[PDB]
Amino acid sequence: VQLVESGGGLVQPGGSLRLSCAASGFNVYSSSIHWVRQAPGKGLEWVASISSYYGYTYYADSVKGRFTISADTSKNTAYLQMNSLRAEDTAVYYCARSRQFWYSGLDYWGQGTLVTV
Amino acid sequence: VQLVESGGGLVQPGGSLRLSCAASGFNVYSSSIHWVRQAPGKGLEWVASISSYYGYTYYADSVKGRFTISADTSKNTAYLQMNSLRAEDTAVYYCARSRQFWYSGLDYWGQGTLVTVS
Amino acid sequence: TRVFKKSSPNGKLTVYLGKRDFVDHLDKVDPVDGVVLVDPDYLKDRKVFVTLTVAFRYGREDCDVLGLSFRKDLFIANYQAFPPTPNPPRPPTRLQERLLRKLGQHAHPFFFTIPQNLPSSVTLQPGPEDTGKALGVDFEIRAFVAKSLEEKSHKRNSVRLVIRKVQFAPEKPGPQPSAETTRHFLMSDRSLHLEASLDKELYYHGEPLNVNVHVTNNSTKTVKKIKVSVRQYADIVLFSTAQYKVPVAQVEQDDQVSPSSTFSKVYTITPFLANNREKRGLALDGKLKHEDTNLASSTIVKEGANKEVLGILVSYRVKVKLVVSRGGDVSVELPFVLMHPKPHATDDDIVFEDFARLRLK
Amino acid sequence: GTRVFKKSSPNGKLTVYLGKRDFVDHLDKVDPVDGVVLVDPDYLKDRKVFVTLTVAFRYGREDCDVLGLSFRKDLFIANYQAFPPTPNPPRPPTRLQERLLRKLGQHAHPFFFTIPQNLPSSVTLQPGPEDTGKALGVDFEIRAFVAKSLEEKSHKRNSVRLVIRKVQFAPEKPGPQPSAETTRHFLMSDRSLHLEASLDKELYYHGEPLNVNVHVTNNSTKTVKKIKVSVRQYADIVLFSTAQYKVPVAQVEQDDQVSPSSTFSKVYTITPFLANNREKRGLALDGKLKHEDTNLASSTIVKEGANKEVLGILVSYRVKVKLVVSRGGDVSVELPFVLMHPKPHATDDDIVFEDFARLRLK
Amino acid sequence: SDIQMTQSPSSLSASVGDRVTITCRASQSVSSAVAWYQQKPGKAPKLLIYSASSLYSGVPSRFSGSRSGTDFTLTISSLQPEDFATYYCQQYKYVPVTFGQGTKVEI
Amino acid sequence: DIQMTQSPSSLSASVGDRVTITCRASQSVSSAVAWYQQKPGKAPKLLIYSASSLYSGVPSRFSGSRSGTDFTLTISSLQPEDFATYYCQQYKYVPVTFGQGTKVEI
Amino acid sequence: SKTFTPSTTDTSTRK
Amino acid sequence: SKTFTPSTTDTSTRK
């Protein structure tokens, strides 16, 4: 069981980036996938979540419209398409995993991809 | 339109008597028939009522069980069978008439039959 | 003068109606105009809506209806009493003006118009086995506070007032009923023939019906019995018209008619509810809450009867059957109107129609 | 640190305390419904407090504007007089009930309910896009109300309703591996088309993929065009006549032709889930305490003893592997599997309603 | 329970041309369902007012009925010598129908 | 939204001491509260879920409690491996909100 | 005190 | 001051 995520890096302000979260050891329909960022010197913050079983996607108020979360169910991977990356979007983004039946916290995390603007 | 009555008279206490109310000028199903008594020196009191359209009979608490009110729909007459006549039953019993659709007071009265006990 | 008044369970909402019965005049219906008193501080950000709902409903009024149920809104009207509509229909009537000047600023009028092609308030009598469930057209007015119409109303701040649409006997009398029917034998040239007629076309509730049966039996068969009956014809129309017959009064006498001999009698028969309480599907007049109403009045419809059919329609006919030896029963039907004098298609629909026919047809 | 659910009366004079909202059927017993009711004895002038355990097969919403047909059938009714206390109550008060009585004082009284073994689970049929929220479903509920007797009508201002659920979880013991075979030979050729499919497991959890091992041995002269793998849900509504409804919940179709006189072997993967089935009418979903989102209904497990045990809706799942062949001759195999959750750590109205149900779904 | 129609006064002395008001108070809040009768001695009663305001057909217009909540009043605007009799107040909203004790009007 | 006011923002402790990290929810969430342990330079690590259920594999010294809307994380016998940052998360309503953190220091 | 469901009454359209 | 219909909450089985 692992959460391998990649795709982050330096982006000019107002730019765009996509984060790929390769999931292993669990199924995309029995688990939901969440993106949680931690700004430098700041606490944890939740930005996005996808439930491929129910076909639901949720976004934070600061990233709604700008961010889209998708899943490759066949590839068992999740994606976070971040567009119009402003200054506030710089953080270390973690791909978290939670059960679908039922939510019991984010029991599996990735390792974080640093995104800078 | 008349409410001729007949049947009252002197009855020994604990006795029985039947009051016949010969209705005329109206139909037994478009009108309800009520018995109202007035003891000497006392006001009006309602004892019984029959609605032949609905098949309902109502009685006062002082006459419940002892009194039965019936109607002869073919003869267009009503009856009040009073049994176990006590001292409190002495009065002048009036046969009143009210509309069935709908009640607007007792617009037609009889003339009263004096019922007395010893 | 007086006005009806029902209040909300919490007392923050009150409805004032001058009438509970509204008369159809065959070209207009009595307009439903009332006054609603609100508590503007209690309703911090909500609006007050009043609805004029009429629905064909099956099943009793409670919530735990064990079995089938069916509802069909025959007409829905909505009025936003508070805040007042910028262009309300009609100026407030005299009674509404008096009510407003009596109750103050926190009282607002509402206006409703009942369309001309609606049924009257009727109710089919539940069967002895049926647990109070009954078909019937019901008019109602509900006032509730809500953010919008689509928001669900709450019992605490909503008040319901059942109203009724009623009709009364037309002043102009109709033509006298009369019916003729003959039944001739296969060989004899003589033909059995009876005449029947009601003295009037319109009868009030509780009024006896005098039928003038006139049999002219010139054949060689003997009429064993003459049966005189009154039948109620509930005509339920939702998507397919289905007529139901309920016998409400029977007069039968053993008056044999000898061959080659005339007959003439005046039978008296009265329809009333006392002997019909055990019948299912018997149409009764609309009840406010639970009171005993009489037999349903005959539904009078306009000459402009393009469709004109909805809910339940009630009609009455007198039948005079002669039970003749060796078959050959001959009958005549005398349709009469029974009223009060004026005081002075979806799957659910089809399935319910099947149900209604199966139950009371 | 044990916590208890509590709901209060709209006027605040009545409160129910239930330690659970879901009650598990163990195929020999159901979790007993033990609760506590707190009353206001001075508010009760000459009135008693009754709690009812009602389970009903209902069609339609819970509101009043329910335009159209509706139905109800109490599959089981239980009544308990909480106050005044029954002279001989069933079972002694449990540990949690005793703790609640100690916490809440003398104006709190227990109630006890027993759910019979043959009752259905809490299920709900998905409303169609054209249905205005109406849904067939078996619903468990508990209502506490004050009244002079049971026959007296309940009042909203004081009655409090708490929906409960009867649930089942995957048996610990595994089941036999599914396996199905079906042959289809032509009119003249002695060779017979034959496929065998099998699931790796008999029991699958919700959201767990299903791996089917299709194995076609086509020695005939006909060519298989495609191989279609489907999952179908079988809702079995039983009120007085059993009506079976099949809803396809997952489809895996791949264009893998099979040449004549050539074997085949593949491991298809298919997962049933609600995302693509939200527009389907008659899709059985799990019981809902409210308007929240539940998954596909778990397979109904029935005891080995025959009895009747048939009521409400029974849910079953089968995997179908259909081969579409040139010149007709389609051959299919069905693999019944059980889909569950792991154990956590002749009245006229009725008959007319079966008519309506067949018209709607079947 | 039953409903008491407390008719006041039990009697009153009047004269021709005077205005006489006979009150009636119901223990329970009945609707307008209240009737008035005039019983001369040695005769059956005679309905005067029904629905607490509707004058019965044939009754002289000097009689009038009014209601103020649960208080019902019978007024004779221009009393005549024919009006010296006993007047009874009846409610018919609920069974049993109850009568007031009467109000004998004397010269 | 819902604010999980975690107190204190930091605390100085030592091995063997008892550390209690509180968490207060602005709105009355249910037991749906989780605790995480994020050492510097590493991803978080779930410790407690449902406000009392210890996650599998977590040492038994960690324990969770709830008193209404107040949630507490306690380490009965603090070890040198426990000096990290602890976050309080509620997941009863979307969006899920995290506490501001509590850096435990030697 | 009246905790029961309010029924339909009447009032005089005056004052 | 809440007038809405009471929902299902929870309480600690203690004290």
Side-chain angles (χ1 to χ4, degrees), chain A, chain B, chain C residues 1-43 45-60 62 64-171 173-184 188 191-302 304-306 309-325 327-361, chain D residues 1-61 63 65-150 152-185 189 192-303 305-306 310-326 328-362, chain E residues 1-14 16-79 81-103 105-107, chain F residues 1-2 4-13 15-64 66-78 80-102 104-106, chain G residues 1 3-14, chain H residues 1 3-14:
Chain A
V1 190
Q2 277 188 134
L3 274 299
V4 179
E5 51 162 312
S6 44
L10 164 65
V11 175
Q12 324 293 293
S16 190
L17 186 147
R18 152 164 278 184
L19 297 156
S20 81
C21 171
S24 289
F26 53 87
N27 301 116
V28 69
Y29 294 109
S30 53
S31 306
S32 55
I33 287 160
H34 318 261
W35 283 101
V36 164
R37 73 172 153 211
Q38 193 182 24
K42 197 187 171 291
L44 289 177
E45 194 211 321
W46 169 90
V47 300
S49 164
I50 183 162
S51 178
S52 48
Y53 188 96
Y54 295 107
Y56 290 152
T57 48
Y58 308 94
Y59 303 97
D61 284 324
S62 62
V63 301
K64 199 171 289 185
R66 314 195 293 113
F67 285 30
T68 62
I69 177 161
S70 69
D72 207 344
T73 62
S74 62
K75 273 186 48 62
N76 204 355
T77 73
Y79 299 98
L80 184 76
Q81 177 66 39
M82 328 191 289
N83 297 300
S84 77
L85 285 182
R86 313 174 307 223
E88 306 94 24
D89 290 335
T90 183
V92 165
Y93 288 74
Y94 295 99
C95 190
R97 177 259 173 196
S98 71
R99 287 190 81 182
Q100 191 67 71
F101 312 105
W102 291 265
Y103 201 113
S104 310
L106 310 161
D107 46 4
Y108 287 100
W109 292 71
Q111 273 297 340
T113 44
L114 167 65
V115 176
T116 52
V117 287
Chain B
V1 190
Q2 284 192 27
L3 277 296
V4 187
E5 312 186 17
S6 48
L10 164 65
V11 161
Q12 319 303 99
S16 173
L17 184 137
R18 153 168 280 201
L19 299 156
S20 81
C21 175
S24 286
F26 52 86
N27 305 117
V28 68
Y29 294 109
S30 53
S31 307
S32 55
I33 287 165
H34 320 259
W35 283 100
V36 164
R37 74 171 152 211
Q38 188 181 31
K42 188 264 291 179
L44 288 177
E45 194 209 318
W46 169 90
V47 300
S49 167
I50 184 163
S51 183
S52 49
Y53 188 95
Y54 295 106
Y56 292 150
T57 48
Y58 308 95
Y59 303 97
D61 284 325
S62 61
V63 303
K64 191 83 178 71
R66 313 196 293 112
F67 286 27
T68 64
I69 178 166
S70 72
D72 207 344
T73 67
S74 62
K75 273 185 47 62
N76 205 355
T77 71
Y79 299 100
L80 184 76
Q81 177 66 38
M82 323 192 292
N83 293 296
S84 76
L85 288 181
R86 312 173 308 222
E88 306 94 24
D89 289 337
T90 186
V92 165
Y93 287 74
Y94 295 99
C95 187
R97 177 258 173 196
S98 72
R99 288 188 81 184
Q100 191 67 71
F101 312 105
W102 291 265
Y103 201 113
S104 310
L106 310 162
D107 46 4
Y108 287 100
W109 292 71
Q111 275 302 333
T113 51
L114 174 55
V115 175
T116 49
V117 306
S118 74
Chain C
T1 185
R2 207 151 285 257
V3 57
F4 293 94
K5 166 181 87 159
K6 203 178 178 175
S7 87
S8 177
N10 54 57
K12 305 288 185 294
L13 188 56
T14 312
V15 175
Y16 297 88
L17 287 173
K19 292 175 285 191
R20 296 286 292 281
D21 296 321
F22 301 89
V23 191
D24 192 313
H25 305 285
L26 295 186
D27 53 347
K28 65 184 179 181
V29 194
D30 272 7
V32 184
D33 43 4
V35 174
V36 161
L37 187 152
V38 301
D39 213 5
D41 59 343
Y42 157 76
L43 58 88
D45 49 295
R46 296 168 285 204
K47 305 193 251 170
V48 173
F49 309 93
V50 293
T51 81
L52 178 59
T53 183
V54 63
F56 196 114
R57 192 177 301 112
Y58 175 68
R60 77 191 89 94
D62 65 1
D64 181 73
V65 180
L66 274 178
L68 204 74
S69 280
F70 176 80
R71 185 185 170 182
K72 180 181 182 67
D73 281 345
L74 312 181
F75 162 81
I76 291 288
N78 284 292
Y79 196 90
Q80 187 201 176
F82 192 54
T85 67
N87 213 1
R90 289 171 274 139
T93 179
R94 186 163 60 100
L95 188 152
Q96 261 173 329
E97 286 173 359
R98 215 178 305 116
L99 262 172
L100 294 176
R101 91 176 72 258
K102 164 197 182 294
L103 297 156
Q105 299 186 2
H106 302 160
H108 306 277
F110 66 81
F111 319 91
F112 288 129
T113 311
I114 305 178
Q116 194 52 40
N117 284 336
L118 266 293
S120 287
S121 293
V122 296
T123 296
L124 264 50
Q125 183 167 246
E129 50 90 14
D130 203 349
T131 307
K133 292 146 85 204
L135 295 93
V137 178
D138 316 316
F139 290 71
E140 205 167 19
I141 291 170
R142 179 187 285 123
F144 60 104
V145 308
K147 210 60 181 288
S148 56
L149 281 174
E150 292 88 351
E151 197 209 321
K152 67 177 209 75
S153 57
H154 310 285
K155 180 183 181 300
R156 55 161 190 285
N157 46 19
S158 68
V159 63
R160 299 194 286 139
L161 204 51
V162 166
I163 57 153
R164 292 189 314 202
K165 174 163 149 164
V166 293
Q167 268 165 329
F168 296 115
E171 292 289 336
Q176 156 170 256
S178 53
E180 316 179 352
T181 309
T182 62
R183 276 200 71 102
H184 47 280
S188 55
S191 314
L192 167 66
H193 155 268
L194 73 165
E195 298 274 345
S197 82
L198 291 160
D199 289 345
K200 278 181 307 152
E201 193 267 330
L202 193 149
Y203 292 94
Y204 305 145
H205 292 263
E207 193 187 340
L209 279 75
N210 289 310
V211 310
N212 306 315
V213 60
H214 183 274
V215 178
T216 314
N217 180 25
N218 56 6
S219 306
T220 53
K221 54 200 78 166
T222 299
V223 166
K224 187 197 45 179
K225 288 195 309 177
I226 299 193
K227 306 195 289 189
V228 193
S229 300
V230 192
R231 297 251 177 89
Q232 187 186 74
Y233 301 81
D235 195 7
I236 301 191
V237 179
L238 296 168
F239 264 104
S240 61
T241 299
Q243 174 189 77
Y244 312 107
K245 295 179 57 165
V246 179
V248 301
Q250 297 85 18
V251 171
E252 172 195 316
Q253 297 178 354
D254 292 331
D255 45 351
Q256 300 223 340
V257 178
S258 50
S260 299
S261 185
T262 54
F263 189 73
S264 162
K265 204 161 185 274
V266 181
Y267 282 82
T268 309
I269 188 160
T270 308
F272 56 96
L273 186 53
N275 53 346
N276 301 333
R277 298 198 165 280
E278 79 278 335
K279 305 203 155 63
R280 191 214 293 174
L282 171 80
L284 306 171
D285 269 323
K287 320 178 176 298
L288 280 183
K289 302 154 61 180
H290 279 309
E291 85 260 25
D292 272 321
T293 44
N294 50 357
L295 302 181
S297 311
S298 286
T299 295
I300 46 170
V301 286
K302 311 177 289 293
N306 307 314
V309 286
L310 193 61
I312 311 157
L313 322 172
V314 191
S315 286
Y316 290 87
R317 296 195 270 234
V318 182
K319 189 174 124 181
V320 187
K321 182 186 283 185
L322 323 175
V323 181
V324 186
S325 176
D329 281 1
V330 62
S331 307
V332 291
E333 274 193 327
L334 294 174
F336 72 98
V337 62
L338 185 80
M339 301 189 90
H340 283 307
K342 306 177 185 180
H344 63 115
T346 56
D347 276 282
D348 52 50
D349 290 303
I350 297 298
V351 171
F352 185 68
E353 286 176 352
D354 293 331
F355 184 65
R357 308 210 190 204
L358 199 154
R359 292 283 290 169
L360 58 84
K361 191 173 176 68
Chain D
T2 310
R3 273 185 176 260
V4 63
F5 297 92
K6 75 161 212 193
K7 203 176 176 175
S8 297
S9 160
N11 61 2
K13 308 289 188 293
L14 196 43
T15 312
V16 194
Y17 296 86
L18 293 175
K20 283 178 282 186
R21 294 288 289 283
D22 298 322
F23 301 89
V24 191
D25 192 320
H26 307 287
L27 292 180
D28 54 345
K29 60 192 170 69
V30 179
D31 271 8
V33 185
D34 305 338
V36 167
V37 160
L38 187 152
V39 302
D40 203 4
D42 52 21
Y43 166 76
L44 301 163
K45 304 174 291 286
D46 47 351
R47 289 175 295 202
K48 309 187 249 163
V49 170
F50 308 93
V51 294
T52 81
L53 177 60
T54 183
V55 62
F57 183 90
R58 293 174 61 189
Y59 173 70
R61 297 172 292 166
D63 51 1
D65 46 352
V66 67
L67 299 177
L69 205 74
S70 281
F71 185 69
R72 194 174 209 274
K73 186 182 181 70
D74 282 343
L75 313 182
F76 163 82
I77 289 286
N79 281 292
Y80 195 90
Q81 181 182 178
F83 192 55
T86 58
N88 298 116
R91 303 191 297 280
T94 184
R95 190 74 265 168
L96 187 148
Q97 263 173 329
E98 268 163 30
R99 283 204 315 263
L100 282 175
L101 262 59
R102 283 194 263 116
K103 170 194 183 175
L104 299 156
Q106 71 177 358
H107 298 341
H109 301 95
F111 65 81
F112 317 92
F113 288 129
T114 309
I115 306 178
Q117 193 40 72
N118 288 334
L119 267 295
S121 291
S122 290
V123 291
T124 298
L125 278 297
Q126 197 185 209
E130 75 275 23
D131 291 350
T132 312
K134 288 179 187 172
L136 297 94
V138 180
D139 292 331
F140 290 71
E141 207 172 17
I142 296 169
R143 177 173 312 183
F145 61 104
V146 309
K148 285 166 280 280
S149 59
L150 283 173
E152 193 201 323
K153 73 177 197 81
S154 183
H155 307 282
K156 177 183 180 301
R157 71 169 177 280
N158 173 276
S159 64
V160 62
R161 298 169 64 190
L162 200 63
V163 166
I164 58 156
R165 284 188 317 199
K166 173 167 152 158
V167 293
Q168 289 177 354
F169 297 114
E172 286 182 345
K173 183 178 179 180
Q177 163 168 68
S179 54
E181 295 168 346
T182 306
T183 76
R184 199 175 183 99
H185 46 281
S189 60
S192 313
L193 170 62
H194 160 83
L195 75 164
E196 162 189 359
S198 81
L199 282 161
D200 289 345
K201 276 180 308 153
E202 192 271 330
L203 196 147
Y204 290 93
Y205 305 145
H206 287 77
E208 192 186 340
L210 275 80
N211 287 311
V212 302
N213 297 317
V214 63
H215 272 64
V216 181
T217 314
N218 182 24
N219 49 22
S220 306
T221 52
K222 55 198 78 165
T223 299
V224 161
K225 188 179 66 179
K226 301 180 300 180
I227 302 195
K228 315 156 72 173
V229 191
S230 298
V231 193
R232 286 180 182 170
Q233 182 189 76
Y234 303 88
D236 197 358
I237 297 177
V238 183
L239 301 160
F240 263 117
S241 53
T242 80
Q244 193 204 28
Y245 307 114
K246 322 178 171 207
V247 182
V249 301
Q251 298 85 17
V252 159
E253 173 183 336
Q254 292 181 10
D255 202 278
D256 45 352
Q257 299 220 344
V258 176
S259 45
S261 296
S262 185
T263 58
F264 191 73
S265 163
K266 213 187 175 77
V267 184
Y268 283 86
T269 309
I270 188 160
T271 308
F273 56 96
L274 186 55
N276 53 348
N277 296 342
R278 282 193 184 284
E279 77 279 339
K280 299 195 156 69
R281 175 154 44 72
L283 174 77
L285 307 173
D286 267 322
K288 291 174 175 64
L289 297 169
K290 272 172 79 179
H291 294 324
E292 86 260 14
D293 212 350
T294 46
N295 51 0
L296 300 183
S298 314
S299 288
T300 288
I301 295 286
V302 286
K303 72 172 74 174
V310 286
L311 204 56
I313 304 106
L314 321 174
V315 191
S316 288
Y317 291 86
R318 296 194 271 234
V319 185
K320 189 185 194 61
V321 189
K322 177 195 272 184
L323 303 176
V324 293
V325 193
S326 173
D330 286 3
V331 58
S332 308
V333 292
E334 276 177 349
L335 301 146
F337 72 98
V338 62
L339 186 80
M340 288 194 104
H341 280 307
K343 175 73 177 172
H345 298 286
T347 310
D348 296 333
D349 45 36
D350 185 77
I351 313 303
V352 165
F353 186 69
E354 288 90 6
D355 304 342
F356 183 65
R358 311 219 188 197
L359 266 47
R360 177 71 68 186
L361 314 171
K362 189 182 286 289
Chain E
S1 58
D2 301 348
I3 294 181
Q4 274 63 62
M5 308 300 288
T6 309
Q7 203 175 345
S8 47
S10 187
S11 64
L12 61 93
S13 294
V16 292
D18 208 50
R19 190 182 176 196
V20 169
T21 65
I22 312 175
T23 45
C24 195
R25 164 84 164 183
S27 66
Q28 200 267 335
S29 176
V30 303
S31 301
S32 282
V34 163
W36 289 94
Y37 304 86
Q38 179 214 55
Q39 177 160 16
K40 288 152 166 258
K43 300 285 151 49
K46 177 183 178 295
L47 179 78
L48 295 182
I49 299 285
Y50 62 97
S51 200
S53 56
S54 314
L55 188 81
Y56 186 55
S57 61
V59 182
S61 166
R62 65 187 172 259
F63 299 85
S64 50
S66 75
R67 171 196 184 202
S68 193
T70 69
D71 274 291
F72 305 84
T73 307
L74 173 77
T75 73
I76 314 165
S77 298
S78 54
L79 183 139
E82 299 158 344
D83 309 344
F84 294 111
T86 315
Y87 295 85
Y88 288 96
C89 165
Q90 179 213 26
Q91 70 95 23
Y92 53 82
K93 188 72 180 173
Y94 306 95
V95 62
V97 299
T98 61
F99 290 82
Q101 296 190 7
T103 295
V105 165
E106 185 62 33
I107 302 179
Chain F
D1 299 341
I2 292 183
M4 309 297 288
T5 308
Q6 207 176 341
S7 49
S9 187
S10 67
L11 62 94
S12 177
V15 292
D17 211 49
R18 265 183 58 112
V19 167
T20 70
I21 312 178
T22 52
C23 195
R24 165 82 162 182
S26 65
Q27 201 266 335
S28 178
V29 304
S30 302
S31 284
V33 160
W35 289 95
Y36 304 86
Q37 180 218 63
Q38 177 162 14
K39 286 150 167 261
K42 300 285 152 49
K45 199 244 184 179
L46 178 79
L47 296 182
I48 299 286
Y49 62 97
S50 180
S52 55
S53 314
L54 188 81
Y55 186 55
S56 58
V58 181
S60 185
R61 36 174 193 279
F62 301 85
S63 50
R66 172 194 182 202
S67 191
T69 75
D70 278 292
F71 305 84
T72 313
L73 173 77
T74 69
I75 315 164
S76 296
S77 52
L78 188 152
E81 319 285 337
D82 308 345
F83 294 111
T85 314
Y86 296 85
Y87 289 96
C88 166
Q89 180 213 24
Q90 70 95 23
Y91 53 82
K92 189 72 179 173
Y93 306 94
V94 62
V96 298
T97 59
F98 289 83
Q100 60 84 30
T102 294
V104 163
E105 307 153 356
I106 300 179
Chain G
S1 175
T3 55
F4 43 71
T5 293
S7 300
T8 311
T9 175
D10 48 7
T11 187
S12 35
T13 314
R14 61 182 295 279
Chain H
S1 97
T3 77
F4 43 71
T5 293
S7 299
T8 310
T9 174
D10 54 318
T11 187
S12 50
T13 305
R14 63 182 296 279

